[PDB]
Design a protein around this ligand. Structure first.
Ligand SMILES: Cc1cc2nc3c(=O)[nH]c(=O)nc-3n(C[C@H](O)[C@H](O)[C@H](O)COP(=O)(O)OP(=O)(O)OC[C@H]3O[C@@H](n4cnc5c(N)ncnc54)[C@H](O)[C@@H]3O)c2cc1C
Length: 537
């Protein structure tokens, strides 16, 4: 009629703290309608290399957006979901109703520049206003890069030093008022021609089915903005009591791998939860009060033990902005070139399928397949095991496996964590036994083997004395407990003692040749490594 404005969802699947959505609603007074649009283009929202679990999470998030639009407009507003190329869909959508502007939340990762540029050039041709808003991150990552002298900060301490100069991140924007917004009804033949979804599809519609084994799902995850704001309320409620109490309880600070999907990592990846609303609700809770207690070596004053977790996310996102080779070693200026072993498919497949013979490694990789989420310490041990603390394979193989099955699986965050853990050759402590030994770690995180028997069911009838080291059982014990090593449960795919030694020498031989390291993504110091891996020291 009078025209319409497009709020194009890729990430930022939420209605709160959406600067692009407010800009799309900025013309309600002129009769300009609103068109919520999501496009399955085969890459957006991490849909090029995706498994069933994350695809289910994304569809849960899209259904939440559509339901909120209906709830606030008495069923007048809908989320239009297409399938195809955006420039093809948007030009013909412009032919039906005159588009005045297309608003998006900035996808700062370089893997999105090609897609966003095709729409940018399409907006110049059709005289469509192209509105881009920085919102998926705490700061504009360029602002951090220009402050650091044109290069992104390569250490977590240098990133903190930069954002201290910049100041606190912006506050979340107001909530969108959709009750008075106008929406369009498209011609059914146009919805016919451009493959607009009548109902929200299932992952099977994109030929995505059960994982590499299937049904070990003990816990499940609900995507969407509504579930994200519920998990945040429960988190702040736990922090409110700890803030009033003045300290964490001893078990609240313990790594709990037997817990539940209370994590909000996937919700922050897809933008179901605003990172700024997260940051400032934690800030307002701890505001103007001096505490003394620490959480895993990090102070509690000002909620720094939580807001700092949102800094790690910002610190890996910023590093990749102007680096299109961020997910590989060859050609990456911020990654240490390490002589990894050439790809060994048998070792890689045994690591993906959780068939390494090491119980904690196998249980973590099978949980990744079943549920798509691992605790930060479980991601630590399986990353070290694949790389410097075991198989000596390239971190690129694990990055590609994580990006398919993780519920979060940010392109920059996952790649940065893989380089941070695997390619920091000058971090002496990283190669210690407190990190590379999954047996000693399994006895700390899972003393009774309950987590191991949950995801490695062949070790169910194995007693606690042998559940962490089943190869220690005698022949009579292996046959009594119905678990023969090499039949029911495979043998260790590698001799860990000789492998860790071999790999430690390769790191020492690597440092002595460079003598002085080139600037690369690395821990800031040894205290940061203790905090990163949850070391009891
Ligand atoms: C090999 C490896 C791969 C990883 N891949 C991802 C990934 O794809 N996506 C992802 O969000 N996180 C990733 N991380 C970081 C970490 O595994 C998760 O952020 C964390 O397990 C999420 O659980 P949580 O929300 O309870 O953590 P919390 O302690 O509650 O963290 C709060 C928030 O801060 C962010 N955050 C916390 N730690 C880190 C970190 N080290 N780096 C970046 N962000 C952080 C999380 O997104 C989370 O929502 C990876 C870590 C490793 C070692």
């Amino acid at each position: 009629t009078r025209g319409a404005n497009v709020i194009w969802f890729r990430h930022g699947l939420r209605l709160h703290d959406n600067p692009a959505l407010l800009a799309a609603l900025a013309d309600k007074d002129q009769g300009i309608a609103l068109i919520p649009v999501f496009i399955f283009d085969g890459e957006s929202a991490g849909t090029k290399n995706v498994g069933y679990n994350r695809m289910r999470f994304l569809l849960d998030s899209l259904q939440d957006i559509d339901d909120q639009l209906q709830a606030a407009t008495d069923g007048r507003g809908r989320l239009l979901v297409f399938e195809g190329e955006p420039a093809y869909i948007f030009r013909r959508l412009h032919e039906q109703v005159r588009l005045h502007r297309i608003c998006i939340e900035q996808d700062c990762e370089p893997i999105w520049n090609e897609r966003d540029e095709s729409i940018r050039s399409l907006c110049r041709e059709l005289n469509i206003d192209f509105v881009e808003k920085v919102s998926h991150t705490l700061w504009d990552p360029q602002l951090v890069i220009e402050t650091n002298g044109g290069i992104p900060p390569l250490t977590y301490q240098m990133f903190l030093h930069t954002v201290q100069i910049i100041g606190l991140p912006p506050r979340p924007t107001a909530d969108a008022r959709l009750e008075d917004a106008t929406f369009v009804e498209l011609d059914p033949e146009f919805c016919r021609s451009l493959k607009l979804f009548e109902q929200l599809p299932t992952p099977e519609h994109f030929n995505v089915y059960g994982d590499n084994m299937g049904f070990l799902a003990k816990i499940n995850w609900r995507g969407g903005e509504t579930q994200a704001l519920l998990l945040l309320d429960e988190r702040l409620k736990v922090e409110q009591h700890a803030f009033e109490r003045g300290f964490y309880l001893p078990n609240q600070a313990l790594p709990n791998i037997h817990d539940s999907p209370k994590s909000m990592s996937a919700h922050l990846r897809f933008g179901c939860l605003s990172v700024r609303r997260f940051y400032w609700s934690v800030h307002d809770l701890f505001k103007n009060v001096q505490l003394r207690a620490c959480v895993r070596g990090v102070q509690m004053t000002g909620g720094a033990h939580i807001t700092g977790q949102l800094i790690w996310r910002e610190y890996f996102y910023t590093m990749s902005v102007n680096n299109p080779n961020y997910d590989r070693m060859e050609g990456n200026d911020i990654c240490l070139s390490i002589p990894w072993a050439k790809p060994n498919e048998n070792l890689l497949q045994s690591w993906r399928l959780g068939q390494t013979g090491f119980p904690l490694i196998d249980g973590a990789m099978r949980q990744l397949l079943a549920e798509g989420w691992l605790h930060h310490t479980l991601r630590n041990t399986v990353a070290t095991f694949l790389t410097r603390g075991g198989l000596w394979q390239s971190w690129e193989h694990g990055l590609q496996h994580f990006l398919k099955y993780l519920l979060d699986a940010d392109w920059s965050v996952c790649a940065g964590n893989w380089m941070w853990v695997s390619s920091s050759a000058f971090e002496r402590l990283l190669d210690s036994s407190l990190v590379t030994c999954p047996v000693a770690l399994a006895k700390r995180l899972d003393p009774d083997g309950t987590y191991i028997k949950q995801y490695v069911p062949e070790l169910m009838n194995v007693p606690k004395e042998f559940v962490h080291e089943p190869w220690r059982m005698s022949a009579e014990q292996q046959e009594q407990y119905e678990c023969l090593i090499g039949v029911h449960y495979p043998e260790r795919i590698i001799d860990l003692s000789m492998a860790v030694k071999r790999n430690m020498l390769a790191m020492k031989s690597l440092r002595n040749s460079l003598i002085t390291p080139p600037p690369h993504c690395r821990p800031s110091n040894e205290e940061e490594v203790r905090q990163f891996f949850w070391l009891a020291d």
